[PDB]
Design a protein around this ligand. Structure first.
Ligand SMILES: O=C(Nc1cc(Cl)c(O)cc1O)C1(c2ccccc2)CCC1
Ligand SMILES: O=C(O)CCC(=O)C(=O)O
Ligand SMILES: [Cl-]
Ligand SMILES: [Cl-]
Ligand SMILES: [Cl-]
Ligand SMILES: [Cl-]
Ligand SMILES: [Cl-]
Ligand SMILES: [Cl-]
Ligand SMILES: [Cl-]
Ligand SMILES: [Cl-]
Ligand SMILES: [Cl-]
Ligand SMILES: [Fe+2]
Length: 434
């Protein structure tokens, strides 16, 4: 028989205390009724403005539309990958300064909730540490830089997946870990919902289990309006969690310390400047001359080229639906990244030209090809993948306002670009020689 534990079961409590001590529940009553109202109306305002979107993600070769709609709010310039989709932050008013009045206010509210949750988390880590620069690690692991807001109306689904192991019933989100977070970083969630036998089907729960293990009955924790739960230290890594759907719609705010060593605007702009150091930079024109044709430098250049194109430009524009409707903060940055990428397209063309030059020893010519082939290979492959995703039946189903864009994209007819979109010819020709 497939079973789970709820607050009804006598054993729920010892299981929580003994097996899940890094799981904290702070009930609505513990949070000011003031913060509750401001946060809940912020949810409603974001919702009314149509700021939350479902995503057309890709999982194990599968194009799938997320039942849950979401928006990422957080530090200016920061990003967070979710299901292989790079979500771009709608900035909250962290010091420094930058949106439609109401949206800006709501972001300020979620920054406010962030401060609160952060302090609460530090509190819990300290009490957890006091159970047996360690303070640096504590603050470090509670320094939420992003929140992912989610919404689902279960009524809008024709059928929900059954929780497969413990008889927990309908799942809004199946068993997983929160990914791409700083090591051992906490996660804080603010949940906003509106005879027995097991967990109450009409009430939203968060479910927990130990990874690899379906022997130990999972925990189903009820989440009433305004309840908050925290995953501390290594809990998110050692355990899986799911969201069990109730009967009414529900929002949540999920504060995280996103790992961002390669996920900020500042970072990717620096990468671009690094690549462009191999380019004579007197004037911005169609004439691109390179300072060096050394293999190591050309390799790095084409890799950065790939990074900006696929991890940034493609990711952003595929999000057909989004920020022109919540921010436009990434407007200018994305125009700038594309112009940077544009110059790099000229860089590739200069390399290809040098590979052609009549007076170049086959030695140096092979060192160049052996250096850049792996990059131009991925460029071709990734370009096919991304083009297909924009044309999937699933994609052409979406309304006009959403439907993914394949930027940047151009036809041969176009002579503002130096190289073709399809490189298979150029790529094969390079391999043949080598
Ligand atoms: O959430 C998803 N699918 C889904 C889940 C539940 Cl729980 C449900 O009740 C109904 C659903 O359509 C996606 C998914 C997420 C991760 C891996 C595989 C698929 C499909 C796009 C997100
Ligand atoms: O909503 C929660 O309680 C956790 C976050 C979640 O399920 C999600 O990633 O959509
Ligand atoms: Cl634990
Ligand atoms: Cl609603
Ligand atoms: Cl920034
Ligand atoms: Cl600890
Ligand atoms: Cl912060
Ligand atoms: Cl609601
Ligand atoms: Cl694991
Ligand atoms: Cl993990
Ligand atoms: Cl430039
Ligand atoms: Fe989740």
């Amino acid at each position: 028989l497939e079973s789970h534990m709820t607050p009804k079961d006598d054993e729920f409590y010892q299981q929580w205390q003994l097996k899940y001590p890094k799981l904290i529940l702070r009930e609505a009553s513990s949070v000011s009724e003031e913060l509750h109202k401001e946060v809940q109306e912020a949810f409603l305002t974001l919702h009314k403005h149509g700021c939350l979107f479902r995503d057309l993600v890709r999982i194990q070769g599968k194009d799938l539309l997320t039942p849950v709609s979401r928006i990422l709010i957080g530090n200016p310039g920061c990003t967070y990958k979710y299901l292989n989709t790079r979500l771009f932050t709608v900035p909250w008013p962290v010091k420094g300064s930058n949106t439609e009045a109401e949206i800006a206010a709501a972001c300020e509210t979620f920054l406010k909730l962030n401060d609160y949750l952060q302090i609460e988390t530090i509190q819990a880590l300290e009490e957890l540490a006091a159970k047996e620069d360690v303070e640096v690690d504590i603050k470090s692991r509670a320094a939420y830089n992003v929140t992912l807001l989610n919404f689902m109306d279960p009524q809008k689904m024709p059928y929900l997946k059954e929780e497969p192991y413990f008889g927990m019933g309908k799942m809004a989100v199946s068993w997983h870990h929160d990914e791409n977070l700083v090591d051992r970083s906490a996660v804080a969630v603010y949940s906003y919902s509106c005879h027995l036998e097991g967990r109450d089907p009409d009430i939203w729960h968060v479910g927990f289990k130990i990874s690899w293990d379906i022997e130990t009955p999972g925990l189903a924790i009820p989440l009433h309006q305004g309840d908050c739960y925290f995953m501390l230290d290594d809990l998110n890594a050692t355990h899986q969690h799911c969201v069990l759907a109730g009967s009414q719609p529900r929002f949540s705010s999920t504060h995280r310390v996103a790992e961002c060593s390669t996920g900020t605007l500042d970072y990717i702009l620096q990468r671009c400047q690094l690549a462009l150091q191999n380019v004579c930079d007197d004037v911005d024109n169609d004439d691109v001359s390179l300072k060096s044709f050394e293999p190591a430098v050309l390799k790095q250049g084409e890799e950065i080229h790939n990074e900006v194109e696929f991890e940034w430009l493609r990711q952003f524009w595929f999000q057909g639906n989004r920020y022109r409707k919540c921010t436009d903060w990434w407007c200018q940055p994305m125009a700038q990244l594309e112009a940077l990428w544009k110059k790099m397209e000229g860089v590739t063309n200069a390399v290809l030209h040098e590979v052609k030059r009549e007076g170049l020893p086959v030695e140096q010519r092979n060192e160049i090809l052996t250096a850049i082939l792996a990059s131009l290979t991925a460029r071709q492959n990734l370009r096919r993948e991304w083009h297909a995703r924009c044309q999937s039946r699933i994609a052409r189903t979406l309304p006009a306002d959403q439907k993914p864009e394949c930027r940047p994209y151009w036809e041969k007819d176009d002579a503002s670009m130096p190289l073709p979109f399809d490189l298979t010819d150029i790529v094969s020709e390079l391999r043949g020689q080598l």
